[PDB]
């Protein structure tokens, strides 16, 4: 089993699903058996025991936006990912070759930490030749100046590295297309090679996203990086 | 209703309970009606939805160390604190005058954040003449050197201020007693007056703790600070 | 002297200068003697820079002003910054012979960056020396928005405000900068998730002329705020 | 050149010097040419200081080396730090005429303090220039213990390790310093809550003579570790 983990930076609604979706379609296009899974961290659940001087303890919980109960979430994530990845999908009746994992929330979210920890551990179980990750981050731009900015993505990538994952591709999302100078800064200040910086701007129909990925040699990259046929 | 909130710094098992307990006893000694309440944040509950490609969503939870369910924990904390504080205690049949609130966990704990937020908001509802807080922090000391350190407490106090509470007294806990130079540094680098730094070292029976507080003029302080009889 | 400190978040080119400038313009039109100090965190040598302040303290140390003692960023640089601000803020301006009543300090850089920390630390400490009613700070931060969705996002400002708080300053006003006007749902979300009242969230969108910035600031009662917060005549 | 960076956490006087020194002593006894660089974050002027490095770059700027450009802490100070480390690390020592194989860099200060950040940032970047097998970093941190309870606590080391990670370095060894020996329950808790294998948690308690420190380090297989981690002969 090969795995591609997709995470998000700086903001939510950054395009995690579309990137995972698109990577799925691209590889199926080359005749690979590909499965998708999503892990969505739940809006944090805040609890506590309240204790009056001389009367019973009330235990207060907190509604989220609204079922298995495990001892260790971290072990449960890695067991459930490994097992679902095997479940045959589409037709094809056989074990998938690539599993595209979609991690909801944004890197830096308090609620995401246990799941990022899960995958930090997992990358060493999977071994490097069968596991890579892709960080989808924002490059903002105010209309008043036109200047696209790399700082938010710089910081996001550092947060990600801090939590133990090194991004194999950085997907830079932006309103208008990214100019070579800014693409050069991302490469240089996030310490990845130029080819690992993929730029996907806002497009008028989703179909264009896979096309842009392919135009930026994503398949050649995944081929070397995961040893794919 | 007057309120004294007790929080902890740098480490757990810092002596929050003993300080709250001792403050309770001291004020009762002056004939005040005093009640105690404890809020203990629960070991964080990590959840998430897992989603296979073409099969039902499993929702995974996480055991803590093991009941009311509210929309906003922050509002629930402040309502429950205000109401319990009124409940007559000991004999005395009448509404307590002072409520000593004990906040479990340590400032900086992810799980403590909503409750510290609760009290940030609460200090403005209670108004300043009826609300103060007391931060019980560690001053460590290695046997190899003997040198007591203020940095952990400096940082703890900054974290506390960052979350919106300014400590009215800093209670410095340590293995051996604190020397004047270190007591001077705490005062100066945590930006409180000398009299707001109270030092309570490790003692051989709990009874000594209230005595040390009184020796360091805690009652004179609470008198001016809360307008007590 | 009363002091207003303008810092920026998330990105450079966020509008620190225009805000610093507009607050100045607004306050002068209510009859107040306003002065301006600019801090540039760069090393090149009423305007202070890392170069100038470090060269000053290095030179002092080098000729023995500190009597052999160990000289450190905190407190020696940070003392020099505070001593430098207080002395500049007193210098008469705009033709007046009397001491300025207010000093708007513009701190270049973006909060979170290493170059700016000596200055943020200087001001963390300075707010305790000044009374509360003689110092406040304003944080100018990005509310970004992809055209694909049109959703304004508050997370970057949340993380920026939390980092500022981390470094010891708590913003009295959060000026949210966006391409298009911030709507009330998003404006309340900033109030909620940063930890401030609604009236402390000031929204300043991209305008077609910068004279509109002080118009927008006055429209959101910034003078009422500063009167109460700094006790101004 | 291979580099080992020693940093400290929670408190000063935590043992950075003894660890830096003991690693050096241990590695020399396995036949390796070891050199030492000390960084002092103070401003006073193979030993570098904030004063020296800032004075150097200020002077360069002042005479026009950077051709009018804006000079900044990052990259100009941080470049100078990295250029300075590489050049010192090459200089022959201990009587040998050949280039040293390993350089132990001792960074004074405590992680989290402003004075140390230019240096931590220099090394965050430097670890990408060097190969992975030519750079690792060791973090010396406090496991405190009140006599009242006798409970060793890991939270301070957790927060310290997370702050180091925040500044862009991830410790390859956490050296936990305590008054009395750390027991296995607490040793596993550090492995768990910081995010590292058990063999990366090295415990060094207060001893009655500092020669015991390298004895304890070798007892916990630090050489085995460095052989694998830095690919050493
Ligand atoms: N490159 C793009 N161009 C235009 N719209 C996009 C692009 N990428 C994503 N979107 C749209 O933006 C929204 C957010 O995308 P989604 O994949 O759901 O993000 P996330 O998975 O991070 O929530 C969706 O409506 C999606 O169709
Ligand atoms: N000053 C002191 N001297 C000796 N023992 C103390 C002192 N303060 C607290 N203790 C003891 O240390 C332990 C922790 O105290 P506790 O109040 O339960 O801390 P917390 O409320 O922060 O958990 C208890 O066993 C308590 O009796
Ligand atoms: N609200 C706004 N609308 C349009 N343009 C703006 C606005 N605020 C700032 N600008 C412009 O953006 C650029 C950057 O502003 P500036 O104040 O120089 O930012 P900073 O001081 O943060 O670097 C300038 O051209 C400025 O006139
Ligand atoms: N494991 C230890 N046992 C006893 N004393 C120690 C130990 N480690 C360091 N020390 C002593 O503690 C003091 C501080 O050590 P040092 O290495 O100078 O700390 P730093 O370099 O972090 O300032 C010195 O007197 C040193 O000999």
Curated annotation (Swiss-Prot), chains C, D:
Domain of life: Eukaryota
Residues of the full protein shown: 1 to 273 of 586
Protein name per its UniProtKB record: CTP synthase 2
Function per UniProt: Catalyzes the ATP-dependent amination of UTP to CTP with either L-glutamine or ammonia as the source of nitrogen. Constitutes the rate-limiting enzyme in the synthesis of cytosine nucleotides.
Family classification: Belongs to the CTP synthase family.
């Amino acid at each position: 089993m090969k795995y591609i983990l997709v995470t998000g930076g700086v903001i939510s609604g950054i395009g995690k699903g579309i990137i995972a979706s698109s990577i799925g379609t691209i590889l199926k296009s080359c005749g690979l058996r590909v499965t998708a899974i999503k892990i969505d961290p739940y809006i944090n659940i805040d609890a506590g025991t309240f204790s009056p001087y001389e009367h019973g303890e009330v235990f207060v919980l907190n509604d989220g936006g609204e079922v298995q109960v495990v001892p260790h979430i971290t072990d449960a994530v890695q067991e459930w990912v490994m097992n679902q990845a095997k479940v045959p999908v589409d037709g094809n009746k056989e074990e998938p070759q690539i599993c595209v994992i979609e991690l909801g929330g944004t890197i830096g979210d308090i609620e995401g930490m246990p799941f990022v920890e899960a995958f930090r551990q997992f990358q060493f179980k999977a071994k490097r030749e069968n596991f890579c990750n892709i960080h989808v981050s924002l490059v903002p731009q105010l209309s008043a100046t036109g200047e696209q900015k790399t700082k938010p993505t710089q910081n996001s990538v550092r947060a990600l590295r801090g939590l133990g994952l090194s991004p194999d591709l950085i997907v830079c999302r932006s309103s208008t297309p990214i100019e070579m100078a800014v693409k050069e800064k991302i490469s240089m200040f996030c310490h990845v090679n130029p080819e690992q910086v993929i730029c996907i701007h806002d497009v008028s129909s989703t179909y264009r996203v896979p096309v842009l990925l392919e135009e930026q040699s994503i398949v050649k990259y995944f081929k070397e990086r995961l040893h794919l046929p």
